[PDB]
Scaffold this active site. Structure first.
Site, PDB file in Angstrom:
ATOM      1  N   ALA A 118       0.819  -1.204   0.000  1.00  0.00           N
ATOM      2  CA  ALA A 118       0.000   0.000   0.000  1.00  0.00           C
ATOM      3  C   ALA A 118       0.857   1.261   0.000  1.00  0.00           C
ATOM      4  O   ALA A 118       0.488   2.274  -0.580  1.00  0.00           O
ATOM      5  CB  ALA A 118      -0.965   0.000   1.210  1.00  0.00           C
TER       6      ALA A 118
ATOM      7  N   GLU B  82      22.350  -6.601 -15.433  1.00  0.00           N
ATOM      8  CA  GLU B  82      23.768  -6.290 -15.637  1.00  0.00           C
ATOM      9  C   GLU B  82      24.697  -7.502 -15.420  1.00  0.00           C
ATOM     10  O   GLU B  82      25.233  -7.651 -14.312  1.00  0.00           O
ATOM     11  CB  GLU B  82      24.140  -5.160 -14.673  1.00  0.00           C
ATOM     12  CG  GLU B  82      23.279  -3.909 -14.930  1.00  0.00           C
ATOM     13  CD  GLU B  82      23.463  -2.830 -13.890  1.00  0.00           C
ATOM     14  OE1 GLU B  82      24.552  -2.750 -13.282  1.00  0.00           O
ATOM     15  OE2 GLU B  82      22.528  -2.028 -13.705  1.00  0.00           O
TER      16      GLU B  82
ATOM     17  N   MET C 253      25.005   3.088 -19.762  1.00  0.00           N
ATOM     18  CA  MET C 253      25.512   3.468 -18.455  1.00  0.00           C
ATOM     19  C   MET C 253      26.932   3.955 -18.680  1.00  0.00           C
ATOM     20  O   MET C 253      27.901   3.310 -18.280  1.00  0.00           O
ATOM     21  CB  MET C 253      25.438   2.274 -17.506  1.00  0.00           C
ATOM     22  CG  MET C 253      23.984   1.986 -17.199  1.00  0.00           C
ATOM     23  SD  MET C 253      23.674   0.643 -16.034  1.00  0.00           S
ATOM     24  CE  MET C 253      23.716  -0.760 -17.055  1.00  0.00           C
ATOM     25  N   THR C 254      27.017   5.091 -19.367  1.00  0.00           N
ATOM     26  CA  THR C 254      28.309   5.657 -19.734  1.00  0.00           C
ATOM     27  C   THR C 254      28.897   6.493 -18.601  1.00  0.00           C
ATOM     28  O   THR C 254      29.121   7.699 -18.743  1.00  0.00           O
ATOM     29  CB  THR C 254      28.186   6.485 -21.061  1.00  0.00           C
ATOM     30  OG1 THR C 254      26.897   7.108 -21.135  1.00  0.00           O
ATOM     31  CG2 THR C 254      28.344   5.587 -22.275  1.00  0.00           C
ATOM     32  N   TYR C 255      29.100   5.822 -17.460  1.00  0.00           N
ATOM     33  CA  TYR C 255      29.705   6.382 -16.236  1.00  0.00           C
ATOM     34  C   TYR C 255      30.206   5.168 -15.398  1.00  0.00           C
ATOM     35  O   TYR C 255      30.108   4.025 -15.861  1.00  0.00           O
ATOM     36  CB  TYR C 255      28.750   7.345 -15.488  1.00  0.00           C
ATOM     37  CG  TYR C 255      27.344   6.846 -15.300  1.00  0.00           C
ATOM     38  CD1 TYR C 255      27.016   6.076 -14.198  1.00  0.00           C
ATOM     39  CD2 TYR C 255      26.352   7.129 -16.231  1.00  0.00           C
ATOM     40  CE1 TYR C 255      25.729   5.585 -14.007  1.00  0.00           C
ATOM     41  CE2 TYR C 255      25.048   6.637 -16.053  1.00  0.00           C
ATOM     42  CZ  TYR C 255      24.755   5.872 -14.950  1.00  0.00           C
ATOM     43  OH  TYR C 255      23.495   5.344 -14.780  1.00  0.00           O
TER      44      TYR C 255
ATOM     45  N   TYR D  35      22.781  -4.629  -7.895  1.00  0.00           N
ATOM     46  CA  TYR D  35      22.591  -5.450  -6.691  1.00  0.00           C
ATOM     47  C   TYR D  35      21.862  -6.763  -6.961  1.00  0.00           C
ATOM     48  O   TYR D  35      22.361  -7.840  -6.623  1.00  0.00           O
ATOM     49  CB  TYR D  35      21.843  -4.668  -5.622  1.00  0.00           C
ATOM     50  CG  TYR D  35      21.573  -5.487  -4.369  1.00  0.00           C
ATOM     51  CD1 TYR D  35      22.617  -5.856  -3.509  1.00  0.00           C
ATOM     52  CD2 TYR D  35      20.279  -5.902  -4.054  1.00  0.00           C
ATOM     53  CE1 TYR D  35      22.370  -6.623  -2.354  1.00  0.00           C
ATOM     54  CE2 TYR D  35      20.024  -6.662  -2.914  1.00  0.00           C
ATOM     55  CZ  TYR D  35      21.071  -7.019  -2.073  1.00  0.00           C
ATOM     56  OH  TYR D  35      20.798  -7.775  -0.944  1.00  0.00           O
TER      57      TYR D  35
ATOM     58  N   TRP E 113      21.469   9.018 -13.320  1.00  0.00           N
ATOM     59  CA  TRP E 113      21.290   8.401 -12.002  1.00  0.00           C
ATOM     60  C   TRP E 113      21.904   9.391 -10.987  1.00  0.00           C
ATOM     61  O   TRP E 113      23.120   9.600 -11.056  1.00  0.00           O
ATOM     62  CB  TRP E 113      22.105   7.093 -11.921  1.00  0.00           C
ATOM     63  CG  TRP E 113      22.096   6.484 -10.526  1.00  0.00           C
ATOM     64  CD1 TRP E 113      22.987   6.729  -9.495  1.00  0.00           C
ATOM     65  CD2 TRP E 113      21.138   5.546 -10.005  1.00  0.00           C
ATOM     66  NE1 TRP E 113      22.637   5.986  -8.369  1.00  0.00           N
ATOM     67  CE2 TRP E 113      21.509   5.261  -8.660  1.00  0.00           C
ATOM     68  CE3 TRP E 113      20.001   4.920 -10.545  1.00  0.00           C
ATOM     69  CZ2 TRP E 113      20.783   4.368  -7.853  1.00  0.00           C
ATOM     70  CZ3 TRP E 113      19.285   4.027  -9.740  1.00  0.00           C
ATOM     71  CH2 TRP E 113      19.678   3.762  -8.421  1.00  0.00           C
TER      72      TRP E 113
ATOM     73  N   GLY F  91      19.052  -3.913 -11.904  1.00  0.00           N
ATOM     74  CA  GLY F  91      20.015  -3.071 -11.238  1.00  0.00           C
ATOM     75  C   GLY F  91      21.170  -3.993 -10.838  1.00  0.00           C
ATOM     76  O   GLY F  91      21.026  -5.231 -10.842  1.00  0.00           O
TER      77      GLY F  91
HETATM   78  N1  0HZ Z   1      21.703   1.522  -3.723  1.00  0.00           N
HETATM   79  C1  0HZ Z   1      22.103   2.561  -4.466  1.00  0.00           C
HETATM   80  N2  0HZ Z   1      21.760   3.817  -4.158  1.00  0.00           N
HETATM   81  N3  0HZ Z   1      22.872   2.393  -5.542  1.00  0.00           N
HETATM   82  C2  0HZ Z   1      22.648   1.302  -6.505  1.00  0.00           C
HETATM   83  C3  0HZ Z   1      23.495   1.564  -7.749  1.00  0.00           C
HETATM   84  C4  0HZ Z   1      22.601   1.607  -8.980  1.00  0.00           C
HETATM   85  C5  0HZ Z   1      23.394   1.270 -10.228  1.00  0.00           C
HETATM   86  N4  0HZ Z   1      23.874   2.539 -10.865  1.00  0.00           N
HETATM   87  C6  0HZ Z   1      23.119   3.219 -11.848  1.00  0.00           C
HETATM   88  O1  0HZ Z   1      23.519   4.286 -12.298  1.00  0.00           O
HETATM   89  C7  0HZ Z   1      21.781   2.636 -12.299  1.00  0.00           C
HETATM   90  C8  0HZ Z   1      21.501   2.954 -13.760  1.00  0.00           C
HETATM   91  C9  0HZ Z   1      20.806   1.702 -14.326  1.00  0.00           C
HETATM   92  C10 0HZ Z   1      21.037   0.540 -13.342  1.00  0.00           C
HETATM   93  N5  0HZ Z   1      21.823   1.138 -12.238  1.00  0.00           N
HETATM   94  C11 0HZ Z   1      22.506   0.484 -11.190  1.00  0.00           C
HETATM   95  O2  0HZ Z   1      22.365  -0.732 -11.020  1.00  0.00           O
END
Ligand code: 0HZ
Ligand code: 0HZ
Lengths: 497, 496
Positions: B67, B142, B210-212, B96, B401, B94
């Site tokens: 909710a 990823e 994800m060009t960083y 993680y 991001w 993502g």
């Molecule tokens: N828990 C956090 N605040 N950070 C997680 C990092 C996210 C990590 N970095 C990124 O820029 C985003 C863009 C797409 C997927 N990402 C990711 O998996």
């Protein structure tokens, strides 16, 4: 196992039609020059050349007097009385008939196209073989490429099936009909079919490599046409195999195909051995019974690796015959090629040639300081190193072009036979030298290596080695979390015992 | 066509479950901070992150109070009242959850395995989209490995089929449901699926690179994490793409993938454009709204290209919060990452930081001479060059991001929007500099050329050029007697 000694007997249609054994101005090399002793020194004679006609069947040049053709072939098969191991093969093709721009090239391409065309073609090869009395089929298509290779492979497989059945039908188990091909001896032409070498060689008794003509007027620098090993001082070439459709990674291609490299006999042999499923025993090393000459060379290194002014067109465009002492060149109208027989005579004619030796390439050469000539050729001495190489590398034997270019006593053929079979010849101490060896490694012929088994869930650093599913793999960069084989980060570098 | 401006809105499960807009100590960046003016500057907000569960379906974190989740999402979709082009996407995955060693990795591998698993997974994505009110699906795995790529492609195709059907059923022709993915912005991970880029991008509206994170503590030498162009003085890397399963020749691989090379934003974009079938309009350039900090650096180059002593492990394996002035770093217990918001405050707080600028990479960096610190980050200035590149290269837009890292006034977002849309902003004279450009040539970016038609029966010398079946080809060696495409001696070097 006795090493093969395969000699080409080439006779042009006009010589067959006017065949005679008592006039060398008509037929320079009649079959009668092949004495019982020479017949015992050969294991195979490749009668050349037959062709493929527009009906897509094996056939003699239409201009051939058939009776005269049978008579020449009979003279060759009669030699079998002196050597129960000798086979008189017939060769279909050759450069003139089968090169891309050759008179009959289309017939080769079309004959191998479909199951029906291949059957008709193969049946015709066995029919000609039995009709004329030959002992096997040799195909010298120079060279199939691209979309033609699968058809070529299937055609060879069909001929093999028909020959094996003929062997049984004829009760020829003691001297089974055979199938061979002449293969490219340099990477440029080899790149046409290299990717499918194992399938090409499977149906064959031998693949006879044309490991000569590796230097010629068509090249800017003079060089040995059949160097066994490389001379760092000589020219190097682009490794065309790097461009074959193999499906290998950049690292695999670079490791297999060092470039630039030395175009040598050892390179061709090692390039064939790098492919999985190509046995050394089927590989036959070709050697030339002729030399190639160049004019306009500079002094300093005996005429080696010099710029030159030798015409490259074919036929020889000029009427100028500059190879001093080479009257055969005048008869044949080309000063750029001379038989060993003739070159030997030039050395006994006090014409001003120095016979020199390159101890890296293990080949001789002539240098004419006064007129600026360079001749690359092979002789009994270079054959000692090549025969030793054949033995050490466990190759099938030697092939040569051609019988008519040996001297009158048949010394080059006698040398080859001696080096393989004479009890009184001992090459155990023959020093193979320090010339450059071809060092490529193919994903198909990796060495045995040992490494810890890959552990899933592990992160590997750059350069780490692991064993996984039959191979040893190395990482090409770091933080590797993927399993070997399943991605670009791993390189196969060895085989697991 | 308006450039996309895609901003991530990330909110951890514990913050959703305790959601509030009046106490930054609980929820540092609530939806109410996305004012109407910021909402108008965005074209997409990627709500993050959802996951794929053991049941192989798209789903929220199990600990999420549904909710509260629905209420946060409704606040985001309410923003659409301020901007009729705005889409609230949701992102699955993502790092993680989906990295090779991540908690849910097997679920991604398994979900795309078969026609049935793909159908169930695709359906769950659309169900979640419709049930919560999202406007599209974004997948951030990823990253799929070579063997899983065909299944991944098939899953995207199935989601595209269902989304296109849903758009018609919902009368959304004016704002169709979309499908995007976050793609690798560096060659190492990109090499996993590079060979099938065309197929991966086909079902997508955009691939957000994800060009960083192109530099980090896991690397030996400090470097800019999102240099637009290369600096010859900086580190260079192995070009992993030359090892992708392309089936190309040595010459083709070599000319497309020079190695070593400079890991830059331009490299990633050009590597994508080198592939046939990858349209520039679908490529979106990602940018970071945060910087990466290193300690233990030495002088001589303002902290750039120096060895360092920063732990690369996650979580931060220590309790030493050494990034002076960074209060958020203490809150988050990691001194290796600092939001632009925090960096801006550190610069105006007299903490010993000098802002420097690398004019080749066109990015800023901080150097702390006293404590030996280096910070690589992006700002409104670096964004001028990246925005100009996006326009010049005809890219689809920008992704970043994350929203909570912009400063309170939303300056970074406002800058991106200005560079693309302001009538009074003129970058015609912006000098893109002399930094190193990625020069690989591939099937997708062959230059236009002209050459005599190839003539059957002709023999060609080394280096000869001919046109055949629509391309210009050149010989790799001499005495070439067969045709381009049927003779490996020819190299395709131009088009038309
Ligand atoms: N828990 C956090 N605040 N950070 C997680 C990092 C996210 C990590 N970095 C990124 O820029 C985003 C863009 C797409 C997927 N990402 C990711 O998996
Ligand atoms: N002028 C030419 N290039 N051709 C005539 C030489 C015959 C040419 N050379 C050879 O050594 C033999 C080996 C097998 C087939 N051959 C060939 O076709």
């Amino acid at each position: 196992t006795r090493k093969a000694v395969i000699g080409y007997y080439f006779i042009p249609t006009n010589q067959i039609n006017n065949y005679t054994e008592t006039d060398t101005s008509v037929v320079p090399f009649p079959v009668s020059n092949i004495t019982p002793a020479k017949a015992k020194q050969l294991t195979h004679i490749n009668f050349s050349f037959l062709d493929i006609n527009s009906n897509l069947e094996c056939a003699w040049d239409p201009a051939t007097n058939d009776a005269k053709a049978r008579d020449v072939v009979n003279r060759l098969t009669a030699l079998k009385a002196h050597n129960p191991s000798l086979r008189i093969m017939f060769s279909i093709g050759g450069w003139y008939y089968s090169n891309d721009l050759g008179v009959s090239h289309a017939n080769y391409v079309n004959a191998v196209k479909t199951p029906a065309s291949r059957a008709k073609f193969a049946q015709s090869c066995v029919r000609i073989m039995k009709d004329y009395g030959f002992d096997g089929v040799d195909i010298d298509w120079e060279y199939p490429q691209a979309a033609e290779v699968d058809g070529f492979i299937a055609a060879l497989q069909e001929i093999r099936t028909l020959l094996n059945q003929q062997t049984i039908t004829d009760g020829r188990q003691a001297l089974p009909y055979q199938l061979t091909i002449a293969g490219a001896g340099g990477a440029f032409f080899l790149s046409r079919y290299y990717s499918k070498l194992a399938q090409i060689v499977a149906p064959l008794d031998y693949i006879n490599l044309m490991t000569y003509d590796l230097a010629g007027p068509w090249e800017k620098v003079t060089n040995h046409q059949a160097a066994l090993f490389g001379d760092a001082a000589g020219p190097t070439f682009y490794n065309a195999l790097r461009e074959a459709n193999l499906g290998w990674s950049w690292e695999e291609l670079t490791r297999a195909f060092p470039s630039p490299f030395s175009l040598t006999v050892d390179a061709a042999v090692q390039q064939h051995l790098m492919m999985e499923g190509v046995p050394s025993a089927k590989i036959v090393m070709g050697v030339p019974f002729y030399g190639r000459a160049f004019k306009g060379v500079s002094g300093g290194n005996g005429g080696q690796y010099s710029s030159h002014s030798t015409p490259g067109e074919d036929p020889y465009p000029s009427t100028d015959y500059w190879l001093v002492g080479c009257e055969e060149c005048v008869r044949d109208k080309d000063p750029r090629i001379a038989s060993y027989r003739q070159l030997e005579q030039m050395l006994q004619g006090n014409y001003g040639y120095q016979r020199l030796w390159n101890d890296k390439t293990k080949t001789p050469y002539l240098y004419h300081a006064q007129n600026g000539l360079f001749v690359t050729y092979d002789d009994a001495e270079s054959f000692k190193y090549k025969a030793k190489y054949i033995k050490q590398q466990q190759l099938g034997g030697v092939m040569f072009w051609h019988l008519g270019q040996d001297n009158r006593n048949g010394d080059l053929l006698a040398a080859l036979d001696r080096y393989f079979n004479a009890a009184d010849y001992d090459d155990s101490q023959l020093d193979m030298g320090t010339g450059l060896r071809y060092t490529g490694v193919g994903p198909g012929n990796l060495p045995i290596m040992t490494a810890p088994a890959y552990v899933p869930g592990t992160t590997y650093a750059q350069g780490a080695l692991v064993s996984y599913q039959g191979y040893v793999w190395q990482t090409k960069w770091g933080y590797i979390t993927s399993a070997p084989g399943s991605d670009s980060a791993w390189l196969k570098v060895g085989r697991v015992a």
